[PDB]
Amino acid sequence: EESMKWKKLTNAQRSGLNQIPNRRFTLWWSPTINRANVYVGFQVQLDL
Amino acid sequence: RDRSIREKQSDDEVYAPGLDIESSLKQLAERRTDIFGVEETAIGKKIGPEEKVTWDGHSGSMARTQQAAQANIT
Amino acid sequence: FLGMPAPLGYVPGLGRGATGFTTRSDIGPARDAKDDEEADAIYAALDKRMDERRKERREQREKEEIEKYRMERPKIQQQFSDLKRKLAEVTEEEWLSIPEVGDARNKRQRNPRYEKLTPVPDSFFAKHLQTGENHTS
Amino acid sequence: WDRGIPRINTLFQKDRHTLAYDKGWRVRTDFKQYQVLKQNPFWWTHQRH
Amino acid sequence: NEVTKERTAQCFLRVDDESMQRFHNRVRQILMASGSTTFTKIVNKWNTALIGLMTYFREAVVNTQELLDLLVKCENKIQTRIKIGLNSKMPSRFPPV
Amino acid sequence: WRVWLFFMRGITPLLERWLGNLLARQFEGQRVESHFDLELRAAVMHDILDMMPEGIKQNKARTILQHLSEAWRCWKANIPWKVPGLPTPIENMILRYVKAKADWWTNTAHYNRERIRRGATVDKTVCKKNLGRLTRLYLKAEQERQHNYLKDGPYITAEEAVAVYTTTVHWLESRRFSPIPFPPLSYKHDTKLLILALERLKEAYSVKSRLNQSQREELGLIEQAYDNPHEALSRIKRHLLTQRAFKEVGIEFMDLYSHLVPVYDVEPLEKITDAYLDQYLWYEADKRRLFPPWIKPADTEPPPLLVYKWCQGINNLQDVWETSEGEC
Amino acid sequence: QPVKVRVSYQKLLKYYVLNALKHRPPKAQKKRYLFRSFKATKFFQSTKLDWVEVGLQVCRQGYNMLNLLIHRKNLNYLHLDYNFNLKPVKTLTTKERKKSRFGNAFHLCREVLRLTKLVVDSHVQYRLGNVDAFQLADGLQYIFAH
Amino acid sequence: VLKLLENMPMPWEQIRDVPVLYHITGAISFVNEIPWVIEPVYISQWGS
Amino acid sequence: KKKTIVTDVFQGSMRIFTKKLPHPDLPAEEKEQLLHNDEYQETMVESTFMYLTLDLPTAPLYKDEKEQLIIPQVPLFNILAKFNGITEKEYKTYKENFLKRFQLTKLPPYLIFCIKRFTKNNFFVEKNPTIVNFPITNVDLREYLSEEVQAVHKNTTYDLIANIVHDGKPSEGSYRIHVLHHGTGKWYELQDLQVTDILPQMITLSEAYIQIWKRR
Amino acid sequence: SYMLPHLHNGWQVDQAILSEEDRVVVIRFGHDWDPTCMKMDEVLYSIAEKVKNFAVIYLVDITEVPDFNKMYELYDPCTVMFFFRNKHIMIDLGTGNNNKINWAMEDKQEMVDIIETVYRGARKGRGLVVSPKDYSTKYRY
RNA sequence: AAGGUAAGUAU
């Protein structure tokens, strides 16, 4: 991810690459963010 | 120069021609009477039988829609 | 191709393998699996009759509102009516003499080369690291 | 250690000799807003000084 | 009074309206320019602005009762921005951890 | 019962129109600011193409719109616009279109700026477009002001300038102020000031960030000056002595959402000289007592401490809080 | 009297004052009458019926109309009961859950027809003999208060 | 919905016959009547 | 009364030829037949005025090729190209355009010129900053009178005696006045309390708004 | 709006979608007079030339061509739809409707990003592409 | 009421 900071990426390609850390943050706090108490509603299980 | 002219010949027309631009402008003016014309109707009205049968996108209705299209030929 | 009539007896959905989609059930006509066209007209005329209560008294007030609004803010086309009238004195040769618009800025501004981004030199990390080291006297 | 307005930290700063020749630094820091395109929340003070 | 060393006057401090408006606009431009931006960067900008304001005034905050509401509203806006980034549907009982 | 009937009389039209347009055979389904420009362009183009004898000259139609762009751009760029081959009626209508669009542009920019100042909830793209419009308007006003100053000469009468200069001369004579000399080639602090100046130029890059060409060029210049301090000092003194013409400096505007703060981008080569000059001037003006204590900030009191000292000075005045004899 | 009834008094006065203040004289009209143009066409007939019978007929007709609206796109995984509660017939998939969405207007119509069903069912219960006339009045009061 | 709810029988009535305008197909049925009442009589009845 | 102190001093008589311009979106044969229908023909209507309103040319809207940001100027006689049979003014209305060419009949002894500034555009009100180029000593309006009334009015020379000038934007602006001392012939400006002696030549280099002229 | 090519019947739309084999066909269903459609069409005209290499933009009048109203649910004032090799491409915009863009976008860069993402995903064979910007909120502050 | 549709081949 750090190697791609300078590889001539388009604006759309670079914008989506600046959201990679968030994908880790959500993973770090997944047991709490992904809860029934905090997100009321139906639940869908992953296909595998 | 050769490769600059080969690509130039193959280039398409991004925008409409003059006739299409003029016709589109007149069609737009025929509806926006708050800009053009004298009388002022609503934004989309042109002022101042047969209904075409169209497929609903369902595989179960392909045959009936096709036959209705065939049955509409005079 | 462009400017070509549609062949007779052609379904725009068919011949292309198109498939529709429904985001909800509240949008679009109900799915379908001469006593009808004479029954829709009855309800349409009924709706028009019910609208006839104030149709003349509200389509007249909106007319005066439109006239009042146009008194202060005229239509855009009328704001160029005199100039549009004066275009009749431009001859065909003069019309052909209209020049094509060019761009003043050169290649370096129109299509600049890619601006490479490079990391900050390591000396900046080093210098930030030097700060915070304090003399003992 | 961390008490005075010119924090006692600054007396032990490694670059305490070059900063003694830095004059008008608060005015310059305030006027930096006309050169950099980012507003400085600590426009009123300098960490080193 | 430096001569009598006695209580003579009393100074009441308050954050000026312009400073509050400047802080609010800074938080607004932090929030609105945060589309394709990491949560950490947004929180860092918010923390920097908040610490700058609070360490500049340090006494005028408590008397400016409007500033307290402004600060908590801005914090709620930042947290809502992060929550919307995590999921489009807002949570009901999001934790502060 | 009657309350729910009164609700019913009001809600009946909604349900009736929602149903009748739902189980019928045929189903039926930021524009304020992007309204007048588009309608004006469409109207002008329609009028021009209508009066155009396009039976032979259809291909000019797109060309016409291009003119309607460049003229507008030429108005937005505050540059002259005079197409030599353009017929006079066509040019007149294009000018009318540009005037109408410019009036709408100015009004929309001011209205959006007032909305943002009040606190209206707006988007980022709207903010950027509005900032661009205000930058163009402010620069046009600044061009007008500079032209007025050049044409109408200095606005300070000779008597006023003489009075100001005499007051300054008398003040300097009273304080016994020795003028700041040119930095000598053997200056005892010629290198410390250069290092201080280069540090300030590198403070903009203290936060780690991706460097573009201009930033890395400036850093290379700073590093070259640091590696050979004496060559840099010689170049600085040469610029101070002989350089009276300078390259253009770019201007942007920091949008604080309540006003616009101008931001100036100077060439790094001139930036080094200006930074060294600033450091030397402030060091000399602090060595001597050029600035009396009442000029702030004074590097010794942070603005909160300035307020504290000001309040203490108020309270410490002789009988300041007395109104027995009506003194105020 | 307690606090809540007093606040009820001020709020009722507030609504009365707002109605009496934001009141404009009715607009002139040509007096087109509905239920008069229905019977002009050959689509409606006139009779006289017990009000409970008409209520049952309207409840059934509204159920039929809502059922027709539910199976609009030939989707049969949403079931409307006779109490006008809309529920899936099974654990519907997420795509089918999206495909079976109705706007606030549909659910508002469903709930108003539910209120009419409640009223008509209370009257039917009274007519059968299950509940007393006083019980029917109290039930109607509870229906309109809750 | 509106026509029958306003023609609701009062607590002092067992059966309330109302005129009905019904669709020829059974699609819909309106209570083609307005509950006209004499106001002193109505108020006295509700007082009773 | 028909002849008060204001009518015989300031009021003059002017003739207007109001011709209705046909709508452009009409057939040429239909256009000419509408013109023949007497609906779109000139109608001479006499009138009386207390002052003559003078329209100014629109601002250049662009920098000049050589001298960038040149102040716009117009000679007075170009502004006074109005009120004659030769020239026409297409007055546009939200309903239809009209062709109204004017023709002076009786010149008042004291003629007031009101220069049209503070024009309300489609979005706000803006002042036309065009500098009026007029003489302050001698003019002649004999070319601005019809041949029938030229014999009646043997005098057509007017001298500027009073001038109003507006400084600043229409949102907030000051009104200065230059007055010609009839006894001495000198020009004095007075902005409220302030009174100064401006040279007569420097009078014409101002954004004039209202002027008063004397035929002597 | 009046500069972009126009398709006048359902067969022309069919051929336009079928003809392009290496470019994404961008079709705006709507009306020229609709203000939302004018904003969308002026943005498309602004980016029409820049996306020439990997996109072709057409305009279809739904009143004149109601041929796809039923299947594509073309009932919003404006609609932008992407096709690739005769295959409708869905975009995870975050608006709940992945099948189309049914609002006017102000910035011309966002539309370029959407077209670029659609082209990448479709050339990779995907039928759904996640947009670089989440449109569940207009980011108004 | 929603902003919670993996997409892809195969019949």
Curated annotation (Swiss-Prot), chain C:
Tissue: Widely expressed.
Location of this chain's protein in the cell: Nucleus, Nucleoplasm; Nucleus speckle
Role according to the record: Involved in pre-mRNA splicing as component of the U4/U6-U5 tri-snRNP complex, one of the building blocks of the spliceosome. Enhances dihydrotestosterone-induced transactivation activity of AR, as well as dexamethasone-induced transactivation activity of NR3C1, but does not affect estrogen-induced transactivation.
Protein name according to UniProt: Pre-mRNA-processing factor 6
Residues recorded with modification Phosphoserine: 81
Disease link: Retinitis pigmentosa 60: A retinal dystrophy belonging to the group of pigmentary retinopathies. Retinitis pigmentosa is characterized by retinal pigment deposits visible on fundus examination and primary loss of rod photoreceptor cells followed by secondary loss of cone photoreceptors. Patients typically have night vision blindness and loss of midperipheral visual field. As their condition progresses, they lose their far peripheral visual field and eventually central vision as well.
Residue numbers of the full-length protein present here: 8 to 199 of 941
Post-translational modifications reported in the UniProt record: Phosphorylated by PRP4K during spliceosome assembly.
Sites of Phosphothreonine modification: 118
Organism: Homo sapiens (Human)
Curated annotation (Swiss-Prot), chain D:
Pathological association: Retinitis pigmentosa 13: A retinal dystrophy belonging to the group of pigmentary retinopathies. Retinitis pigmentosa is characterized by retinal pigment deposits visible on fundus examination and primary loss of rod photoreceptor cells followed by secondary loss of cone photoreceptors. Patients typically have night vision blindness and loss of midperipheral visual field. As their condition progresses, they lose their far peripheral visual field and eventually central vision as well.
Protein name per Swiss-Prot or TrEMBL: Pre-mRNA-processing-splicing factor 8
Assembly with partners or alone: Part of the U5 snRNP complex. Component of the U4/U6-U5 tri-snRNP complex composed of the U4, U6 and U5 snRNAs and at least PRPF3, PRPF4, PRPF6, PRPF8, PRPF31, SNRNP200, TXNL4A, SNRNP40, DDX23, CD2BP2, PPIH, SNU13, EFTUD2, SART1 and USP39. Component of the U5.U4atac/U6atac snRNP complexes in U12-dependent spliceosomes. Within the minor spliceosome, which acts on U12-type introns, interacts with PPIL2 and RBM48. Core component of U2-type precatalytic, catalytic and postcatalytic spliceosomal complexes. Found in a mRNA splicing-dependent exon junction complex (EJC) with SRRM1.
Tissue expression from the record: Widely expressed.
Compartments where found: Nucleus; Nucleus speckle
Residue numbers carrying N6,N6-dimethyllysine: 14
Superkingdom of the organism of origin: Eukaryota
Gene (UniProt): PRPF8
Residue range from the parent sequence: 1412 to 1460 of 2335
Curated annotation (Swiss-Prot), chain I:
Signal peptide residues on this chain, from the entry's feature table: none
Subcellular location: Nucleus
Domain of life, per lineage: Eukaryota
Positions of the USP domain: 1-216
Family, per entry: Belongs to the peptidase C19 family.
Function in brief: Deubiquitinating enzyme that plays a role in many cellular processes including cellular antiviral response, epithelial morphogenesis, DNA repair or B-cell development. Plays a role in pre-mRNA splicing as a component of the U4/U6-U5 tri-snRNP, one of the building blocks of the precatalytic spliceosome. Specifically regulates immunoglobulin gene rearrangement in a spliceosome-dependent manner, which involves modulating chromatin interactions at the Igh locus and therefore plays an essential role in B-cell development.
Self-association and partners: The U4/U6-U5 tri-snRNP complex is a building block of the precatalytic spliceosome (spliceosome B complex). Component of the U4/U6-U5 tri-snRNP complex composed of the U4, U6 and U5 snRNAs and at least PRPF3, PRPF4, PRPF6, PRPF8, PRPF31, SNRNP200, TXNL4A, SNRNP40, SNRPB, SNRPD1, SNRPD2, SNRPD3, SNRPE, SNRPF, SNRPG, DDX23, CD2BP2, PPIH, SNU13, EFTUD2, SART1 and USP39, plus LSM2, LSM3, LSM4, LSM5, LSM6, LSM7 and LSM8.
Protein name: Ubiquitin carboxyl-terminal hydrolase 39
Species this chain originates from: Homo sapiens
Gene transcribed to yield this protein: USP39
Swiss-Prot record, chain J:
Name of one Pfam family that matches: DIM1
InterPro entries: Dim1 (IPR004123), Thioredoxin-like_sf (IPR036249)
Cited SUPFAM superfamilies: Thioredoxin-like
PTM comment text: The disulfide bond seen in structures determined by X-ray crystallography and NMR is not essential for protein folding and function.
Domain of life the protein comes from: Eukaryota
Keywords carried by this UniProt record: Cell cycle, Cell division, Deafness, Disulfide bond, Mitosis, mRNA processing, mRNA splicing, Nucleus, Phosphoprotein, Spliceosome
GO biological process assignments: cell division; mRNA splicing, via spliceosome; RNA splicing, via transesterification reactions; spliceosomal complex assembly
Modified residues (Phosphoserine): 131
Disulfide bonds: 37-78
Family as reported in the entry's similarity comment: Belongs to the DIM1 family.
Medical condition linked: Burn-McKeown syndrome: A disease characterized by choanal atresia, sensorineural deafness, cardiac defects, and typical craniofacial dysmorphism consisting of narrow palpebral fissures, coloboma of the lower eyelids, prominent nose with high nasal bridge, short philtrum, cleft lip and/or palate, and large and protruding ears. Intellectual development is normal.
PANTHER family in the record: THIOREDOXIN-LIKE PROTEIN 4A (PTHR12052:SF5), THIOREDOXIN-LIKE PROTEN 4A, 4B (PTHR12052)
Function, as annotated: Plays a role in pre-mRNA splicing as component of the U5 snRNP and U4/U6-U5 tri-snRNP complexes that are involved in spliceosome assembly, and as component of the precatalytic spliceosome (spliceosome B complex).
Protein's name according to its UniProt entry: Thioredoxin-like protein 4A
Species assigned in the record: Homo sapiens (Human)
